[PDB]
Amino acid sequence: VDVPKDLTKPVVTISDEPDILYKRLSVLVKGHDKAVLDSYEYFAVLAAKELGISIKVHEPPRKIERFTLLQSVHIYKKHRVQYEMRTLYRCLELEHLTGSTADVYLEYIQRNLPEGVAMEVTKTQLEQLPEHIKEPIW
Amino acid sequence: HYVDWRMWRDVKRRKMAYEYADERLRINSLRKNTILPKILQDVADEEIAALPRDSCPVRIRNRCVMTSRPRGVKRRWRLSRIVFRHLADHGQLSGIQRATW
Amino acid sequence: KNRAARVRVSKGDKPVTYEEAHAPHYIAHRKGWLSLHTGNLDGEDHAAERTVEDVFLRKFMWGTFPGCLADQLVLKRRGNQLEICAVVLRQLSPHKYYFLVGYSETLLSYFYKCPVRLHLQTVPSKVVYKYL
Amino acid sequence: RKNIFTGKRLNIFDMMAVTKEAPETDTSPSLWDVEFAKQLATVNEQPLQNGFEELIQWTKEGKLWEFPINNEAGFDDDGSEFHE
Amino acid sequence: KFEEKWSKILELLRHMVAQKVKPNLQTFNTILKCLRRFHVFARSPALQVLREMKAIGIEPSLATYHHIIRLFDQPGDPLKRSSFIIYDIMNELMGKRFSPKDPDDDKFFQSAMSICSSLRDLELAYQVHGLLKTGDNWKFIGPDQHRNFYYSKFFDLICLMEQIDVTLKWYEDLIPSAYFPHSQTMIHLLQALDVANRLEVIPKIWKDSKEYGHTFRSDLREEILMLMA
Numbered sequence: 001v002d003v004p005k006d007l008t009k010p011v012v013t014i015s016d017e018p019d020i021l022y023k024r025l026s027v028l029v030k031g032h033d034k035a036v037l038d039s040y041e042y043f044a045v046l047a048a049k050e051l052g053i054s055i056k057v058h059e060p061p062r063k064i065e066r067f068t069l070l071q072s073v074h075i076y077k078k079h080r081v082q083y084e085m086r087t088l089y090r091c092l093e094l095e096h097l098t099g100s101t102a103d104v105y106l107e108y109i110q111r112n113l114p115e116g117v118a119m120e121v122t123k124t125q126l127e128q129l130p131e132h133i134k135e136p137i138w
Numbered sequence: 139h140y141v142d143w144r145m146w147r148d149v150k151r152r153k154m155a156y157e158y159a160d161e162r163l164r165i166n167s168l169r170k171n172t173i174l175p176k177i178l179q180d181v182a183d184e185e186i187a188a189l190p191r192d193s194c195p196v197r198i199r200n201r202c203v204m205t206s207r208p209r210g211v212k213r214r215w216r217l218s219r220i221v222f223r224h225l226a227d228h229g230q231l232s233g234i235q236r237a238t239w
Numbered sequence: 240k241n242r243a244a245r246v247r248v249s250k251g252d253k254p255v256t257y258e259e260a261h262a263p264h265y266i267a268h269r270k271g272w273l274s275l276h277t278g279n280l281d282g283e284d285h286a287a288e289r290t291v292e293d294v295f296l297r298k299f300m301w302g303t304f305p306g307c308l309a310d311q312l313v314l315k316r317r318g319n320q321l322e323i324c325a326v327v328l329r330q331l332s333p334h335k336y337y338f339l340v341g342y343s344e345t346l347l348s349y350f351y352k353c354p355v356r357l358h359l360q361t362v363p364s365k366v367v368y369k370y371l
Numbered sequence: 372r373k374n375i376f377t378g379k380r381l382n383i384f385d386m387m388a389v390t391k392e393a394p395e396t397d398t399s400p401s402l403w404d405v406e407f408a409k410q411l412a413t414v415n416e417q418p419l420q421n422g423f424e425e426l427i428q429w430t431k432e433g434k435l436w437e438f439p440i441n442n443e444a445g446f447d448d449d450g451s452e453f454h455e
Numbered sequence: 456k457f458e459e460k461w462s463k464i465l466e467l468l469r470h471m472v473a474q475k476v477k478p479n480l481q482t483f484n485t486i487l488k489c490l491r492r493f494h495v496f497a498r499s500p501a502l503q504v505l506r507e508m509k510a511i512g513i514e515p516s517l518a519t520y521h522h523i524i525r526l527f528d529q530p531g532d533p534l535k536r537s538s539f540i541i542y543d544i545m546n547e548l549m550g551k552r553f554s555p556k557d558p559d560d561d562k563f564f565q566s567a568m569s570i571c572s573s574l575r576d577l578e579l580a581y582q583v584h585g586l587l588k589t590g591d592n593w594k595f596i597g598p599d600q601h602r603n604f605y606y607s608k609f610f611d612l613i614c615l616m617e618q619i620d621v622t623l624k625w626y627e628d629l630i631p632s633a634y635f636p637h638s639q640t641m642i643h644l645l646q647a648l649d650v651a652n653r654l655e656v657i658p659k660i661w662k663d664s665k666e667y668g669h670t671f672r673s674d675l676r677e678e679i680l681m682l683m684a
């Protein structure tokens with residue numbers, strides 16, 4: 001029964017400036033845990049579907065970096081300990097977005113990036129020919 | 139409060155080298171070409187040699203930041219093999235596991 | 240014989256937690272990592288500074304809550320935030336816990352220039368996984 | 372059956388059609404004005420109500436990064452141009 | 456006496472107009488706050504001050520109405536004038552989002568709810584709470600002791616004047632998420648359960664009472680046992 005009566009919605013102002021057009025966004029996420037990337041993918045894909053964004057997911061091949069260290073503090077060179085760091089990937093490829101749509105989607109999924117997961121967002125922006133290149137001056 | 143006097147000497151070298159880096163780069167550029175006159179390049183040779191010895195970057199040593207071990211240090215973590223393994227074997231380094239394949 | 244992080248068999252009377260019972264070759268098999276950040280991912284920077292910070296925080300919390308911690312810390316980093324998750328005991332009065340949480344969150348936020356939260360979970364006694 | 376707003380009023384103060392056309396913005400506030408503005412921020416002061424509100428407060432104070440992430444946030448190398 | 460003080464105040468207002476000084480919101484709020492000592496003599500004058508504000512264009516804030524209801528709400532059984540004022544004030548304030556204008560804006564809701572309990576009008580109380588919940592008005596509830604007083608008076612009026620089935624919904628939503636109940640509010644809830652002939656809930660009230668720090672309150676323990684037996 002104790003429910004808010006009216007809610008102040010955040011003010012979104014439509015500007016008089018034209019919006020940016022993104023042909024593609026490539027959201028590459030890196031992690032040490034595959035199940036955490038599975039959960040993040042499900043969340044990211046569901047968010048895209050609910051917002052009307054075309055999304056395709058693929059898994060780039062994993063990178064395993066290995067290195068060797070001595071076993072003992074002193075001598076015993078033949079005995080080693082070998083460590084590794086596994087980097088797993090998931091690539092969300094969004095298409096045909098505007099600057100506003102990308103700004104909202106990226107803020108939403110980036111704020112919910114789980115601990116231990118990095119992201120590299122490659123943004124392809126559609127532009128028109130510079131005004132100076134329309135015709136030669138010579 | 140550094141681990142030992144050796145670490146403290148490296149701290150001072152890194153500080154002095156930082157302060158003189160621009161001057162050393164400018165003078166060294168005068169010497170690393172065949173364009174400028176050799177008379178000028180000889181005076182630059184003396185000038186860079188007169189700078190304090192602890193400004194020379196080759197004297198800096200990558201010691202373990204925790205124990206000051208001068209060898210067996212992994213550059214990415216700046217830790218000796220012993221200290222790195224202690225933290226890794228206790229599961230305290232994100233994403234580092236024992237390798238088997 | 241290997242020694243690293245192996246609690247050795249006693250008479251069957253030494254209580255060990257789940258983390259202390261698992262040797263280093265289980266760190267990605269049966270137990271997870273006590274710290275999660277991006278420093279150690281491929282192509283990522285600042286692994287060294289994250290490591291020093293983690294070592295300091297584990298020392299800071301051990302001395303700031305003396306005798307209260309029931310197991311190892313779980314350090315989480317999300318963007319700018321640092322979240323410390325600690326399993327503590329139910330011996331110290333709640334007033335002293337609230338004081339120490341307000342003190343540690345403020346002092347650590349000013350030391351590492353980032354928002355720091357401390358999430359305490361209390362247990363009646365140390366959780367015993369097995370008796371070695 | 373009479374509304375409290377309808378009735379006799381004090382006519383000492385005449386009806387002010389508009390406010391002051393230009394305030395003294397250049398003049399710095401006195402200690403009284405600063406302190407009075409601090410009392411108006413307390414009536415509306417409440418404890419954080421949920422996790423979202425804590426994140427909102429941090430963002431307003433400048434403690435939390437603003438999303439979407441901009442790797443050059445707060446760094447405009449003296450407003451220099453590419454040709455410089 | 457009031458008449459002399461009123462003349463003095465009016466003289467300053469006439470000095471203010473003579474010097475071409477325009478009154479702000481605080482000018483009127485101090486008049487109303489000062490007019491609270493003269494309990495029954497300032498009622499009509501205070502309303503004149505409010506009517507003057509609206510004409511000039513100064514919009515009454517929550518503090519303005521707080522001072523008025525405090526002036527009009529003195530220890531009197533009829534509360535006939537108080538009844539009219541609060542009903543009219545609530546009609547004006549319905550669905551108004553407020554912003555901090557006067558340091559006393561935070562004292563309105565506790566005073567409004569206290570009058571609703573004195574009048575024992577649940578519909579008026581729901582209007583006051585409705586105003587608190589619109590937009591960001593909830594932030595004007597005030598410090599902790601203000602918040603506890605407001606909710607104590609509000610929940611005590613619900614238990615008394617509303618069906619038990621709705622009272623229990625308000626009980627679940629408000630406690631502990633909104634406030635921690637006083638031992639006397641548990642007694643009122645037990646009395647409401649008695650009137651409704653719903654005594655199967657008494658064991659639950661005891662459990663909740665122990666969880667809210669009333670395990671060793673003598674008054675509460677005696678009431679529960681008496682009702683059960």
Ligand SMILES: [Mg+2]
Nearest residue numbers: 196197198199
């Ligand atoms: Mg060397």
Ligand SMILES: [Mg+2]
Nearest residue numbers: 071079240241
């Ligand atoms: Mg061996």
